[PDB]
Structure 1
């Protein structure tokens, strides 16, 4: 929108519930050095499927930056959770931990 202010829109394209994201879900503020000063995190819905609840989660933009160079990009993101799993293998670390892969 301007120097050091970016509007953020969010949208769950995995479900119909995610209507046109025409509202500023949030906004990010940066200082003169391009350091994210505000808009750190937002609790954002996941949308829903087969009765599964629309969790919602804290999306953090911590340490995001606005700098002269580069192209708008994503340099690491994390999904704090899992899908279903099947016991592929067994492994023992030299610290005595027994783990499942």
Structure 2
């Protein structure tokens, strides 16, 4: 997941096309690190490009895979209503690249709770993922309801 506050007053970038290497071809970049089943980290870059009023194209790219094709088509488009609430495009399946001969990760990316503010600066408030590479028992505890938990 990635929760972003986007600025309704932002410009549509004049520099085309979108390119991960041209910093004035997009409005905002964020990152979320995901894992494959081998446990390799993939640093997934997420780019937001305002296309017109209330719509933002979203590109993704596995920055950790040198063989990955540069993103020329959007993974999704976020559409916000008049109140700046996310109305569509908020959920999209992403497939990573591959690292050191290991199979890619495939995950649902959610933009839930993202909003378009009347005025502000583009800003990522939160990211989250259910991926990780173990891992060793550090402590354990008995809670006051008797639940036993490992940390």
CA apart distance, 1:46: 2.1
Unaligned runs of 5+ in 1: none
For residues 37-78 of structure 1, give each alpha carbon's deviation from its aligned partner in whole angstroms, at most 9, with x where no partner exists.
Answer: 000110001222233321210001112111122211111111
Residues paired across the two proteins, number: 101
Alpha carbons of 1:97 and 1:15: their partners in 2 closer, same or farther (altered >3 Å)? same
Alpha carbons of 1:42 and 1:89: their partners in 2 closer, same or farther (altered >3 Å)? same
Larger fraction in strand:
2
Unaligned runs of 5+ in 2: 1-50
Moved over 2 A (4+): none
The one of the two structures with greater contact order (alpha-carbon pairs below 8 A, sep at least 6) is 2
Equivalent residue runs for 1:1-101 within 5 Å: 1-101=51-151
TM-score (norm 2): 0.63
CA distance in 2 between partners of 1:50 and 1:20 (Å): 19
Larger radius of gyration: 1
For residues 12-53 of structure 1, give each alpha carbon's deviation from its aligned partner in whole angstroms, at most 9, with x where no partner exists.
Answer: 001113221121121111111111100011000122223332
